[PDB]
């Protein structure tokens, strides 16, 4: 597990998705991951599940501004907090337990070769 390398997420709506390791935590049990988000911009709001997850697409802050500005906070250059998650230059940065990522024998998919 090294910063800058790829892992596959094992839990949640991002289960199965490829992610870059951004930062290994001080407590040595977590890892901040850079992830292509799966968002709806609050479209049908009044717990998401893996089975019903959205398609992956980079975060679009102007789309968030247009559709759900109440939940959008600018934090820095290219950094927004949207619905209490952080997006920097379009990617989600989210902490996962190291035990919830796969670091070994990852096989990039056709789709991942096209993207990354």
Swiss-Prot record:
Q: In which domain of life is the source organism classified?
A: Eukaryota
Location in or out of the cell: Nucleus; Mitochondrion; Chromosome
Q: Where is the KOW domain?
A: 1-34
Entry note about domains? The C-terminal repeats are critical for activity.
Subunit note: Component of the SPT4-SPT5 complex. Interacts with RNA polymerase II. Interacts with SHE2.
Give the miscellaneous note.
It is phosphorylated in a PKA-dependent manner in vitro.
Q: Which family does it belong to?
A: Belongs to the SPT5 family.
The free-text function statement in the UniProt record for this protein reads: The SPT4-SPT5 complex mediates both activation and inhibition of transcription elongation, and plays a role in pre-mRNA processing. This complex seems to be important for the stability of the RNA polymerase II elongation machinery on the chromatin template but not for the inherent ability of this machinery to translocate down the gene.
Q: What protein am I looking at?
A: Transcription elongation factor SPT5
Species this chain originates from: Saccharomyces cerevisiae (strain ATCC 204508 / S288c) (Baker's yeast)
Whole-protein residues included: 382 to 508 of 1063
